[PDB]
């Protein structure tokens, strides 16, 4: 129990932090990855002067603060502001003292060696956690779907990745990163919806375009004869009621937004798209492992939640793969937390105890120890 209860799992994202206790089924804490700094001197009624704001209080009060994102494209870019988000996570969100809890953290696919050593330096030397561990994100997603070999298409708020994993070892030279994700996708909907003849003028109009994207957006299979369908004008249309009455209608654009993930050309991107990239990762891997990867395309991440994403991907890679092959696109329902759940499982596991980096290992080996 000492640490069975006690292991923490913190998944640091570009848009959201997911956090909680190893053992739980889902994150106890989910909140924006921002750190707000007040543009002016003054106070809220009853509070003192605050130097900084994090998560939702930074989002809610955004009009008087300069908002900053510590993690650009999955990599920690500002370490002063990240130690601020961690502090908030332990002390306010989970309300635990960190110096008696083992902490499993996550990093990104080709996270620079030096960063994995730096967050270890900050975990052990400024938070004084007993022990910690850094798992790679795609690797926890795979594992949370039971398996050990597969290829994960991972897509969240600032990055998309393909991480081919074989008997647990993520394959460095076959990993692909595509910098277009849910953030890019909300801003494109924004324009095709103002372009539908609308105005997201106040900040209460801006924010909810993102809630339109999440609730009403679709990834149609045969996106071709779906536009064609749009035109005959079926009961395909969908009206959403705004903060007030102002019933906005979205028929068609509803799927023009996730067609951006297959066609980056919709947004002036010259890069290849999700399905081709799944494939290219795969023809960059060893030959003998390619049947395995093809029958185990695990999807994780908030942006892979658009319904019919899996069917489109299913047919997208069948028709690029040699017919002798078995294609299989696994997309679980909890996928917006796969990464986290994979960490919860792993860290609550009976056999993981012997991989925890302890302060004994650290004080004796330097940050190098956990770096592997």
């Amino acid at each position: 129990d000492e640490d069975e209860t006690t292991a923490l799992v913190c998944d640091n994202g570009s848009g959201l932090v997911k956090a909680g206790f190893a053992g739980d089924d889902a994150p106890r804490a989910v909140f924006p990855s921002i750190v707000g700094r007040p543009r002016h001197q003054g106070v809220m009624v009853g509070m003192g002067q605050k130097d900084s704001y994090v998560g939702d209080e930074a989002q809610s009060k955004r009009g008087i603060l300069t908002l900053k994102y510590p993690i650009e494209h999955g990599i920690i870019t500002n370490w002063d502001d990240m130690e601020k988000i961690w502090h908030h996570t332990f002390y306010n969100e989970l309300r635990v003292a960190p110096e008696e809890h083992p902490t499993l953290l996550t990093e990104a696919p080709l996270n620079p060696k030096a960063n994995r050593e730096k967050m270890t330096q900050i975990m052990f030397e400024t938070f004084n956690v007993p022990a910690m561990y850094v798992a790679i994100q795609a690797v926890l997603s795979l594992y949370a779907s039971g398996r050990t070999t597969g290829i994960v298409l991972d897509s969240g708020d600032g990055v998309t990745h393909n991480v081919p994993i074989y008997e647990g070892y993520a394959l460095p030279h076959a990993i692909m990163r595509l910098d277009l994700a849910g953030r890019d996708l909300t801003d494109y909907l924004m324009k095709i919806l103002t372009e539908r003849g609308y105005s997201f003028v106040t900040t209460a109009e801006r924010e909810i375009v993102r809630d339109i994207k999440e609730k009403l957006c679709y990834v149609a299979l045969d996106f071709e004869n779906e536009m064609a369908t749009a035109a005959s004008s079926s009961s395909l249309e969908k009206s959403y009621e705004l903060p007030d009455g102002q019933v906005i209608t979205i028929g068609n654009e509803r799927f023009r937004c996730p067609e951006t993930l297959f066609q980056p050309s919709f947004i002036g991107m010259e890069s290849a798209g999700i399905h081709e990239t799944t494939y290219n990762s795969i023809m960059k891997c060893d030959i003998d492992i390619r049947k395995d990867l093809y029958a185990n395309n695990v999807m994780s991440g908030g942006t892979t939640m658009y319904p019919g994403i899996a069917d489109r991907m299913q047919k997208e890679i069948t028709a690029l793969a040699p017919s002798t092959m078995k294609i299989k696109i696994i997309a679980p329902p909890e996928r917006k937390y796969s990464v986290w759940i994979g960490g919860s499982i792993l860290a609550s596991l009976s056999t993981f105890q012997q991989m925890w980096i302890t302060k004994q290992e650290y004080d004796e080996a330097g940050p190098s120890i956990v770096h592997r």
């Binding site: 809220m44 009624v45 009853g46 509070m47 003192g48 002067q49 605050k50």
Partner: protein, 643 residues
Amino acid sequence: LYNLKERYAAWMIYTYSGLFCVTVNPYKWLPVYNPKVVLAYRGKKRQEAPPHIFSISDNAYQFMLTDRENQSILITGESGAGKTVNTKRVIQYFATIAASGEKKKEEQSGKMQGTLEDQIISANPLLEAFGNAKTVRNDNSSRFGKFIRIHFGATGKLASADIETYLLEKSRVTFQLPAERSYHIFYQIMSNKKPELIDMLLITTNPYDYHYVSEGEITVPSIDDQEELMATDSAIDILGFSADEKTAIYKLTGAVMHYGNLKFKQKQREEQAEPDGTEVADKAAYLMGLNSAELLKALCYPRVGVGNEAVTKGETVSEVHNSVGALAKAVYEKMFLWMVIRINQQLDTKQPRQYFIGVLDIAGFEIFDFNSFEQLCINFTNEKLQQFFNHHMFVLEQEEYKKEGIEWEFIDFGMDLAACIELIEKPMGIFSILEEECMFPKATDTSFKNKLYDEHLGKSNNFQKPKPAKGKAEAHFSLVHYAGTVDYNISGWLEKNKDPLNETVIGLYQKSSVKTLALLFATYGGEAEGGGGKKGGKKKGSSFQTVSALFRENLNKLMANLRSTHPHFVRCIIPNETKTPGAMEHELVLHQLRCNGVLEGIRICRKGFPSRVLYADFKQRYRVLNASAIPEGQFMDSKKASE
């Protein structure tokens, strides 16, 4: 720790620790308060006699006439330390050793109403019935603080007195912990020694009929409610109260019981409160010189004044029950305040006054896993009192090194505490932020909280964010007092600090047939002019703006009175939670010592020249060393001697 302990196991309760006069609860009887002792300690420096309270108390007197300065005695300790006892005992002392009403001295209804020396005395037993109760620690715990000014004459004979009350435990009136009980009065009255009373008030003799007063315990073996009732009764009289008033008091004390019996129910299909009967209201109404109806309306359909008019507002069941309770408490309090005033009034003589001796009885810094508003107020009081000492000592010390000719330079010892005090009492400090937000019609405890931080956090050292775990219950803010770190919970503060009262009702009181009741409310009725419309400032018409706005004013008027005084200190101690004579838990006494000031006086002593002997205390004990030449020195000049 060890010295105290040893002389206790030997049954010596009075040991000095510098200027202090430590006192340990015997938990049994002693010939110390002995009528022989009283004399013995009469005219003796504390070096001519062993450690005892009359030493302090006499010296004060002495000093009073010798230096022509006013004096003070500061008694302080935890709930079970037994201060009242001392306080009282000190008081008798004064009365005895310097009375002489000449005519009042005869054995003809001696000490009955009609003399002060008695009034002076009789005072206590009234206040005690109303401001005292069975605590889980004491059986007669003081649920309020107090300050008496014994105004001595020119000659040196008694002339006047002056009481002042601070921080009354309003909550007892409505609540009570499981092993405790409410004020005595209630139990006194239902005791049945004066059966008329029962019928007069319209109550029964079984307390379980009055929820407000039987939530905890009803009877205490060591107390004879029947005897007290008279004590109380008789005291009132001596105190010069009018029968009528003496009738108001009673009648008023029963109304309050009744209130807690007032019941309500939800109007059908409505979320409104509607009276669940006019059985009790009737009694409460009559007893207060009110009208049942008018009363139940005001209560249910509070008619407010938002904007420039008076808007009738509807309340919920939960809202009523709570408002009622608010008046119950409000009324009791006020009354209590009044009684004090009335007492003071009798204790007013025309004879000239040249000096006084103030006897202050209040609580000491207590730390609880749970510290709320009330704790801050008290702690703040103490942290002030402490600085008050640290300074007196600095002043004092420095005289010696000046008298002797030593060359020692040092900074005021008070200074160390100024940091904490400013943070509380200064303008952008806690109280202010507390009392401002109270002006915001839509503020939250949470609101208040943030304001507290944004402004003090990171910028102030004594200011800190809590340590939520250990024996503590939640988080909000810790402070760094001299005694240590106190973890404060801010929840209810805003309210508690606003003293919200249904003004419609108060209206009724204001026009009662029961003058006294009418009186008690006057000062509320005279400030309404000032807070006529919604929002704004109550003070415009003389209404309190803060729960804390006075406390401060009173605490200032006090600490000022304390200054034009020659401070005399007394620290009361509590041996063991278990109530056993000749015993002591260590850490329990240790605690007190830190929060007492005792350990801080030792510190300041040790900076330096630790042990410091008072001259007579020096003569006596050591004359024998060069017997001839040291005795001559000590006798020939109390000081020059030791030299």
